[PDB]
Structures are given as C-alpha cells and as structure tokens.
C-alpha cells in the first residue's frame, strides 16, 4: 500500500538489549511502510529532490529509483538501564519511536 | 485564502479538501494505464507550471470545486 | 551494492520544468542508491530506530523491513526562472542536490 | 582518546581505522552464512552491550588492534 506509519512492537529481549535495558520490556516503535508513488502527497512532506527523483523514475525506472518511505520525526522514550551495574533512569532516550513518516 | 476542492485519490480522508489551489494530476507509470488524481495544493505551486510530458500532466485552478470533473491528456 | 551517493543528472526539459526554469538546462542532483545492511556504518548516521529496525529485520524479514538509503543533507542550487514572464535570479533554490546519504 | 583498529568490512577505506573502540560484529541474515565485520566504533556503544542472539553478536575492545583476529560465535 502507500507510505504510512504502521505498528511495530519491539521486545528488548528478542534483540538482546535486555542485558542493559531494565525497563520497559519493550515498546511501540512503529515503522514506515509503503511505496512513494508520484504524486507525493504533501503530508509526506516531500523534498524537491524527492519530487524530481520521483519524476525521473516515472520517465525511466532504470535512471532513478522511487523515493523512499522513511521516518521524519522520531520521539524519545523513557527507560531504566544499567550503568556499571547501577539501575538509572534515562528520561529522554532520543530517537526511538516514529511520530511522522515521510517520502525522501 | 483557501479554496474547497474535489478530493479523489488514495490520500483523501473524504470527498473534499481545502487548500490554496485545486489540482488534477494525470500520471502514467511505465507499463500501466494513466491514473488520475484530484486534490488540493498548498506547496510546490511550481509543479502546476510544468509542460505536459508523456508520463505526467498537472492542472491547477483556484475556484470552488474547479477540479471536479476536469480530465487531462498526456503527450503522445 | 551498499548505500552511497551516486550520479544523477537532471535535464529540466525531460521533465517539463524548462517552461519556467530558464537556466541552467539541468544539474547534478545525485541520488542515494544501495542497501542498508546490518551493521549500519556510522558515516550513514543511522538513528536508533533504524538500528533497532535493522535488528528486527535480521531476526524476521516479515516483521520489519530493512532501513532505507535516503538523502540526509540537501544543497541548494542557483537558477533563473520566470516570475510572471519576468526572468529573475533565485540565489538559493533549496533542497535540490544530495550532499549526504544516510540510512533511516 | 582514540585507538587504532583493524578495518575489515565493505565500508573500509583501508586496512585500519581509528575510533573510540574497536569492533567485531558477526551477522547471520536469514538464509545466508554468518558474515564477520571488523572496524571501529564512536557512537552506539550500547550495541557492544547486547547479549548474543541467533542472528547477531557484537564484540568491542579498546586496545591497539585488539580486534585483529577475534572470532565470534552465534547462539544455537
């Protein structure tokens, strides 16, 4: 389908990060899934480069690839983690969950 | 000053939208049949200004529902 | 191959923008081409989300997709364009050429 | 304080690099044979800290060329 934010739940144990992230056991990270087909909707905040590349790809699919659906604003989460064996509270662990998808 | 436009595309939350101008975009992707999109524009007014090509054609207008049943053609 | 900036020359006439862009007739826009395979090199400035998503994709390719190679810094170019039939000089037409690729 | 590390990966400009620590990363992508990367680290020290899994294992060290011929194993 078209580029949009979709659910993606991360379990820290599944990727081995529970060795140092004490809490929470996981969180809703989301992901950006879908194609960026011309014309690029304005809520996907396309750049001029993405628009031009999308146009060239339309004319010749081997000269340029499609623009890509990627996160454009990320949000922090709060965690507890081990710092030298000491459980500490990190208020804004930045860049962890998608708030906005975009075409780039 | 915004204008109300017919909305007819995968990205529409309803039958109309409001924006600075109304749009129709005709797109032919390689190997497929040309597909028509109708909506509103607020950024990238310059897209309105491009010459039609074999693969794309833009139309923009700024009257109430001015894009409702406009139909475009592509270059040969 | 791997995510990197690659050549991409844009001819304004080919996409119909010569009706309003008077000069230059085209420019080197570049594009970001390639896969973002774990581990994500630090010069691709991956976010934490991209790293985590890359890790989940490694464990299950149907739970999340790979991170994506996209431009992360764009540069302006200078143009001449028609404003109501008057040829004018736009010094920094922003967001037109890739200076940096990245995994997101 | 930087350390010099063996560089052995698609992203190396040469046989060594300098960074805050040295790295080895063993990666098994679905359906393929595990692949070993060696290089330096400056960000994402936390990756050094993850428990090994069936699909990935990180090793980090901060001595001169300390990653030169370290070899890792993945979980069963």
Short mmCIF file of C-alpha atoms in Angstrom, two decimals:
data_model
loop_
_atom_site.label_atom_id
_atom_site.label_comp_id
_atom_site.label_asym_id
_atom_site.label_seq_id
_atom_site.Cartn_x
_atom_site.Cartn_y
_atom_site.Cartn_z
CA UNK A 1 0.00 0.00 0.00
CA UNK A 2 1.01 3.65 0.30
CA UNK A 3 3.65 5.12 2.60
CA UNK A 4 2.34 5.37 6.15
CA UNK A 5 3.16 4.68 9.77
CA UNK A 6 2.33 1.11 10.80
CA UNK A 7 2.58 -0.83 14.09
CA UNK A 8 5.90 -2.33 15.16
CA UNK A 9 6.33 -3.58 18.71
CA UNK A 10 9.94 -4.10 19.87
CA UNK A 11 10.71 -6.69 22.53
CA UNK A 12 14.12 -5.86 24.02
CA UNK A 13 14.77 -9.48 24.95
CA UNK A 14 14.32 -10.66 21.37
CA UNK A 15 17.21 -8.46 20.22
CA UNK A 16 19.38 -8.96 23.30
CA UNK A 17 19.06 -5.42 24.68
CA UNK A 18 17.50 -6.60 27.96
CA UNK A 19 21.05 -7.22 29.22
CA UNK A 20 21.28 -3.45 29.77
CA UNK A 21 17.75 -2.02 29.35
CA UNK A 22 15.97 -2.91 32.60
CA UNK A 23 12.57 -1.38 31.82
CA UNK A 24 10.27 -1.37 29.99
CA UNK A 25 10.46 -4.88 28.45
CA UNK A 26 9.58 -3.35 25.10
CA UNK A 27 7.78 -0.55 23.36
CA UNK A 28 5.81 0.59 20.32
CA UNK A 29 8.43 1.76 17.87
CA UNK A 30 6.26 1.89 14.73
CA UNK A 31 7.67 1.73 11.20
CA UNK A 32 7.12 3.49 7.89
CA UNK A 33 5.81 1.03 5.27
CA UNK A 34 4.60 1.57 1.71
CA UNK A 35 5.52 2.99 -1.70
CA UNK A 36 6.06 6.66 -2.53
CA UNK A 37 4.29 6.90 -5.89
CA UNK A 38 4.07 10.11 -7.87
CA UNK A 39 2.47 12.45 -6.99
CA UNK A 40 3.96 12.70 -3.47
CA UNK A 41 1.24 13.75 -1.02
CA UNK A 42 2.04 16.92 0.87
CA UNK A 43 1.54 15.25 4.26
CA UNK A 44 4.57 13.10 3.40
CA UNK A 45 6.48 16.46 3.27
CA UNK A 46 8.46 15.53 0.13
CA UNK A 47 11.62 17.48 -0.62
CA UNK A 48 12.17 18.98 -4.05
CA UNK A 49 14.83 16.33 -4.64
CA UNK A 50 12.36 13.54 -3.83
CA UNK A 51 9.79 15.08 -6.21
CA UNK A 52 12.32 15.44 -9.02
CA UNK A 53 13.65 11.92 -8.46
CA UNK A 54 10.09 10.57 -8.43
CA UNK A 55 9.54 12.35 -11.76
CA UNK A 56 12.69 10.89 -13.34
CA UNK A 57 11.77 7.41 -12.11
CA UNK A 58 8.37 7.80 -13.78
CA UNK A 59 10.09 8.56 -17.09
CA UNK A 60 12.69 5.79 -16.75
CA UNK A 61 12.72 3.25 -13.92
CA UNK A 62 16.40 2.45 -14.52
CA UNK A 63 17.67 6.06 -14.34
CA UNK A 64 16.44 6.67 -10.78
CA UNK A 65 14.65 4.69 -8.11
CA UNK A 66 11.44 5.65 -6.36
CA UNK A 67 11.53 7.98 -3.40
CA UNK A 68 11.54 6.12 -0.09
CA UNK A 69 9.11 5.97 2.82
CA UNK A 70 11.16 6.77 5.96
CA UNK A 71 10.58 8.30 9.41
CA UNK A 72 10.89 12.08 9.51
CA UNK A 73 10.23 12.79 13.17
CA UNK A 74 11.24 10.44 15.96
CA UNK A 75 10.17 10.62 19.60
CA UNK A 76 12.09 9.70 22.76
CA UNK A 77 11.04 7.08 25.28
CA UNK A 78 11.86 6.73 28.98
CA UNK A 79 13.93 3.75 30.13
CA UNK A 80 15.70 2.28 33.13
CA UNK A 81 19.16 1.00 32.25
CA UNK A 82 22.28 -0.44 33.88
CA UNK A 83 25.19 1.99 34.18
CA UNK A 84 28.08 -0.02 35.67
CA UNK A 85 25.57 -2.28 37.39
CA UNK A 86 23.59 0.69 38.79
CA UNK A 87 19.97 0.97 37.65
CA UNK A 88 19.44 4.54 36.46
CA UNK A 89 16.54 6.50 34.97
CA UNK A 90 17.01 7.98 31.49
CA UNK A 91 14.17 10.43 30.88
CA UNK A 92 14.58 11.14 27.13
CA UNK A 93 16.28 8.30 25.31
CA UNK A 94 16.08 10.04 21.94
CA UNK A 95 15.22 8.72 18.50
CA UNK A 96 13.31 5.56 19.43
CA UNK A 97 9.73 5.80 18.12
CA UNK A 98 8.31 7.12 14.83
CA UNK A 99 5.91 10.04 15.14
CA UNK A 100 5.92 11.05 11.43
CA UNK A 101 6.55 9.22 8.17
CA UNK A 102 7.75 10.97 5.05
CA UNK A 103 8.95 10.45 1.49
CA UNK A 104 12.60 11.27 0.85
CA UNK B 1 -7.27 32.41 1.39
CA UNK B 2 -8.17 28.74 0.91
CA UNK B 3 -10.46 27.10 -1.64
CA UNK B 4 -12.52 23.91 -1.44
CA UNK B 5 -11.59 21.16 -3.88
CA UNK B 6 -12.79 17.77 -5.01
CA UNK B 7 -10.67 15.09 -3.37
CA UNK B 8 -10.28 11.88 -5.37
CA UNK B 9 -7.06 9.96 -4.58
CA UNK B 10 -5.62 7.27 -2.25
CA UNK B 11 -4.75 10.02 0.25
CA UNK B 12 -8.21 11.58 0.74
CA UNK B 13 -9.93 11.50 4.14
CA UNK B 14 -13.17 12.50 2.42
CA UNK B 15 -14.76 13.72 -0.82
CA UNK B 16 -13.39 17.27 -0.49
CA UNK B 17 -10.37 19.08 0.90
CA UNK B 18 -9.32 22.71 1.33
CA UNK B 19 -6.08 24.28 0.18
CA UNK B 20 -4.53 27.18 -1.64
CA UNK B 21 -5.42 25.73 -5.06
CA UNK B 22 -7.11 22.67 -6.56
CA UNK B 23 -5.19 20.05 -8.50
CA UNK B 24 -5.60 17.34 -11.09
CA UNK B 25 -2.58 15.13 -11.83
CA UNK B 26 -2.52 12.55 -14.61
CA UNK B 27 0.28 10.00 -14.20
CA UNK B 28 1.41 7.19 -16.48
CA UNK B 29 3.90 4.88 -14.76
CA UNK B 30 5.86 2.54 -17.07
CA UNK B 31 3.74 -0.34 -18.38
CA UNK B 32 0.45 0.73 -16.76
CA UNK B 33 -2.61 2.81 -17.68
CA UNK B 34 -2.68 6.55 -16.83
CA UNK B 35 -4.16 7.25 -13.40
CA UNK B 36 -5.93 10.48 -12.41
CA UNK B 37 -5.60 12.18 -9.01
CA UNK B 38 -7.66 15.13 -7.76
CA UNK B 39 -6.98 17.11 -4.64
CA UNK B 40 -5.63 20.32 -3.19
CA UNK B 41 -2.27 22.02 -3.26
CA UNK B 42 -0.52 24.18 -0.71
CA UNK B 43 3.17 23.68 -1.53
CA UNK B 44 5.01 23.07 -4.80
CA UNK B 45 2.97 25.50 -6.88
CA UNK B 46 5.79 25.19 -9.41
CA UNK B 47 4.53 21.69 -10.31
CA UNK B 48 1.46 23.45 -11.71
CA UNK B 49 3.75 25.19 -14.20
CA UNK B 50 5.48 22.26 -15.91
CA UNK B 51 4.87 21.48 -19.55
CA UNK B 52 2.91 18.23 -20.04
CA UNK B 53 5.04 15.19 -20.91
CA UNK B 54 4.42 11.61 -22.00
CA UNK B 55 4.24 10.46 -18.39
CA UNK B 56 2.72 13.31 -16.35
CA UNK B 57 0.38 16.30 -16.62
CA UNK B 58 -0.55 18.78 -13.87
CA UNK B 59 -3.56 21.07 -13.77
CA UNK B 60 -4.21 23.65 -11.07
CA UNK B 61 -7.09 26.06 -10.54
CA UNK B 62 -8.26 28.16 -7.64
CA UNK B 63 -12.06 28.30 -7.85
CA UNK B 64 -14.56 26.43 -5.68
CA UNK B 65 -14.57 22.76 -6.77
CA UNK B 66 -12.86 23.83 -10.01
CA UNK B 67 -11.17 20.41 -10.36
CA UNK B 68 -14.37 18.38 -10.03
CA UNK B 69 -14.52 16.77 -13.46
CA UNK B 70 -11.57 18.18 -15.39
CA UNK B 71 -9.90 15.47 -17.47
CA UNK B 72 -6.37 15.70 -18.86
CA UNK B 73 -4.43 14.09 -21.68
CA UNK B 74 -0.76 13.14 -21.88
CA UNK B 75 1.67 13.79 -24.71
CA UNK B 76 1.86 11.16 -27.45
CA UNK C 1 25.81 -2.54 -3.60
CA UNK C 2 25.85 -0.61 -0.33
CA UNK C 3 24.10 2.69 0.41
CA UNK C 4 26.01 5.58 -1.13
CA UNK C 5 25.64 8.74 -3.17
CA UNK C 6 25.68 8.06 -6.92
CA UNK C 7 25.49 10.28 -10.02
CA UNK C 8 22.12 11.52 -11.26
CA UNK C 9 21.96 14.30 -13.84
CA UNK C 10 18.60 16.06 -14.20
CA UNK C 11 17.62 17.62 -17.53
CA UNK C 12 14.85 20.14 -16.87
CA UNK C 13 13.44 19.74 -20.37
CA UNK C 14 12.97 16.00 -19.93
CA UNK C 15 10.60 16.57 -17.01
CA UNK C 16 8.92 19.68 -18.42
CA UNK C 17 10.37 22.18 -15.94
CA UNK C 18 12.09 24.22 -18.66
CA UNK C 19 8.76 26.02 -19.17
CA UNK C 20 9.62 28.02 -16.03
CA UNK C 21 13.28 27.28 -15.18
CA UNK C 22 15.28 29.36 -17.67
CA UNK C 23 18.78 28.37 -16.54
CA UNK C 24 20.67 26.16 -16.12
CA UNK C 25 19.32 23.49 -18.53
CA UNK C 26 20.00 20.88 -15.87
CA UNK C 27 22.15 19.96 -12.93
CA UNK C 28 23.82 17.19 -10.93
CA UNK C 29 21.22 16.15 -8.39
CA UNK C 30 22.80 12.86 -7.27
CA UNK C 31 20.83 10.04 -5.66
CA UNK C 32 21.26 7.64 -2.75
CA UNK C 33 21.43 4.03 -4.01
CA UNK C 34 22.12 0.77 -2.18
CA UNK C 35 21.06 -1.46 0.69
CA UNK C 36 21.36 -0.64 4.40
CA UNK C 37 22.55 -3.98 5.78
CA UNK C 38 23.26 -4.56 9.44
CA UNK C 39 25.53 -3.29 10.87
CA UNK C 40 24.76 0.30 9.81
CA UNK C 41 28.03 2.17 9.23
CA UNK C 42 28.41 5.27 11.35
CA UNK C 43 29.02 7.50 8.32
CA UNK C 44 25.43 6.71 7.28
CA UNK C 45 24.46 8.38 10.63
CA UNK C 46 21.82 5.76 11.50
CA UNK C 47 19.20 6.66 14.07
CA UNK C 48 18.49 4.34 16.98
CA UNK C 49 15.17 3.49 15.34
CA UNK C 50 16.93 2.49 12.11
CA UNK C 51 19.39 0.31 14.08
CA UNK C 52 16.60 -1.38 16.03
CA UNK C 53 14.52 -1.90 12.89
CA UNK C 54 17.56 -3.31 11.09
CA UNK C 55 17.99 -5.72 14.02
CA UNK C 56 14.35 -6.86 13.94
CA UNK C 57 14.53 -7.35 10.17
CA UNK C 58 17.58 -9.56 10.68
CA UNK C 59 15.60 -11.75 13.07
CA UNK C 60 12.46 -11.84 10.91
CA UNK C 61 12.24 -10.31 7.43
CA UNK C 62 8.44 -10.20 7.60
CA UNK C 63 8.19 -8.32 10.92
CA UNK C 64 10.11 -5.24 9.71
CA UNK C 65 11.75 -4.12 6.50
CA UNK C 66 15.34 -3.02 6.06
CA UNK C 67 16.35 0.51 6.85
CA UNK C 68 16.41 2.74 3.78
CA UNK C 69 19.17 4.62 1.98
CA UNK C 70 17.95 8.25 1.67
CA UNK C 71 19.47 11.74 1.42
CA UNK C 72 20.17 13.36 4.78
CA UNK C 73 21.59 16.70 3.71
CA UNK C 74 20.49 18.53 0.59
CA UNK C 75 22.15 21.55 -1.01
CA UNK C 76 20.61 24.49 -2.88
CA UNK C 77 21.35 25.44 -6.46
CA UNK C 78 21.10 28.79 -8.24
CA UNK C 79 18.54 29.21 -11.04
CA UNK C 80 16.97 31.75 -13.34
CA UNK C 81 13.20 31.38 -13.53
CA UNK C 82 10.13 33.08 -14.99
CA UNK C 83 8.04 35.04 -12.49
CA UNK C 84 5.02 36.34 -14.43
CA UNK C 85 7.11 36.34 -17.59
CA UNK C 86 9.99 38.20 -15.90
CA UNK C 87 13.32 36.36 -15.76
CA UNK C 88 14.56 36.54 -12.17
CA UNK C 89 17.58 35.23 -10.27
CA UNK C 90 16.94 32.84 -7.37
CA UNK C 91 20.17 32.50 -5.41
CA UNK C 92 19.35 29.57 -3.08
CA UNK C 93 16.68 27.30 -4.52
CA UNK C 94 16.77 24.93 -1.55
CA UNK C 95 16.67 21.16 -1.38
CA UNK C 96 17.82 20.26 -4.90
CA UNK C 97 21.07 18.26 -4.71
CA UNK C 98 22.22 15.50 -2.35
CA UNK C 99 25.31 16.27 -0.30
CA UNK C 100 24.95 13.37 2.21
CA UNK C 101 23.33 9.94 2.11
CA UNK C 102 22.12 8.17 5.21
CA UNK C 103 20.26 5.13 6.50
CA UNK C 104 16.89 5.83 8.11
CA UNK D 1 41.38 9.28 23.29
CA UNK D 2 41.20 7.21 20.10
CA UNK D 3 42.53 3.72 19.37
CA UNK D 4 43.70 2.14 16.12
CA UNK D 5 41.69 -0.84 14.90
CA UNK D 6 41.76 -3.46 12.18
CA UNK D 7 39.32 -2.49 9.45
CA UNK D 8 37.78 -5.40 7.54
CA UNK D 9 34.36 -4.60 6.03
CA UNK D 10 32.67 -3.20 2.88
CA UNK D 11 32.97 0.31 4.37
CA UNK D 12 36.75 0.43 4.96
CA UNK D 13 38.93 2.97 3.14
CA UNK D 14 41.99 0.99 4.23
CA UNK D 15 43.28 -1.82 6.45
CA UNK D 16 42.95 0.19 9.68
CA UNK D 17 40.78 2.91 11.19
CA UNK D 18 40.80 4.96 14.38
CA UNK D 19 37.94 5.39 16.81
CA UNK D 20 36.91 5.30 20.43
CA UNK D 21 36.81 1.48 20.48
CA UNK D 22 37.38 -1.46 18.14
CA UNK D 23 34.54 -3.70 16.98
CA UNK D 24 33.80 -7.14 15.63
CA UNK D 25 30.24 -7.86 14.50
CA UNK D 26 29.04 -11.30 13.43
CA UNK D 27 25.78 -11.19 11.46
CA UNK D 28 23.59 -14.00 10.15
CA UNK D 29 20.91 -12.72 7.77
CA UNK D 30 18.06 -15.15 7.03
CA UNK D 31 19.11 -17.98 4.70
CA UNK D 32 22.79 -16.99 4.40
CA UNK D 33 26.08 -17.79 6.13
CA UNK D 34 27.26 -15.62 9.05
CA UNK D 35 29.43 -12.70 7.95
CA UNK D 36 32.12 -11.03 10.08
CA UNK D 37 32.80 -7.28 10.16
CA UNK D 38 35.73 -5.58 11.89
CA UNK D 39 36.13 -1.88 12.41
CA UNK D 40 35.91 0.99 14.84
CA UNK D 41 33.16 2.46 16.94
CA UNK D 42 32.47 6.01 18.04
CA UNK D 43 28.70 6.05 18.56
CA UNK D 44 26.24 3.40 19.74
CA UNK D 45 28.47 1.97 22.46
CA UNK D 46 25.29 0.33 23.75
CA UNK D 47 25.42 -2.14 20.83
CA UNK D 48 28.57 -3.50 22.49
CA UNK D 49 26.43 -4.44 25.49
CA UNK D 50 23.74 -6.63 23.93
CA UNK D 51 23.51 -10.32 24.71
CA UNK D 52 24.45 -12.51 21.72
CA UNK D 53 21.49 -13.90 19.76
CA UNK D 54 20.97 -16.40 16.96
CA UNK D 55 21.44 -13.70 14.35
CA UNK D 56 23.96 -11.19 15.73
CA UNK D 57 26.93 -10.88 18.11
CA UNK D 58 28.91 -7.73 18.96
CA UNK D 59 32.39 -7.55 20.44
CA UNK D 60 34.12 -4.33 21.44
CA UNK D 61 37.57 -3.68 22.87
CA UNK D 62 39.72 -0.61 23.28
CA UNK D 63 43.34 -1.73 22.86
CA UNK D 64 45.58 -1.18 19.85
CA UNK D 65 44.46 -3.56 17.07
CA UNK D 66 42.58 -5.57 19.71
CA UNK D 67 40.02 -6.76 17.12
CA UNK D 68 42.59 -8.07 14.64
CA UNK D 69 41.74 -11.77 14.68
CA UNK D 70 38.99 -12.17 17.25
CA UNK D 71 36.35 -14.63 16.03
CA UNK D 72 32.81 -14.85 17.42
CA UNK D 73 30.09 -17.46 17.55
CA UNK D 74 26.32 -17.06 17.40
CA UNK D 75 23.70 -18.67 19.61
CA UNK D 76 22.38 -22.07 18.50
#
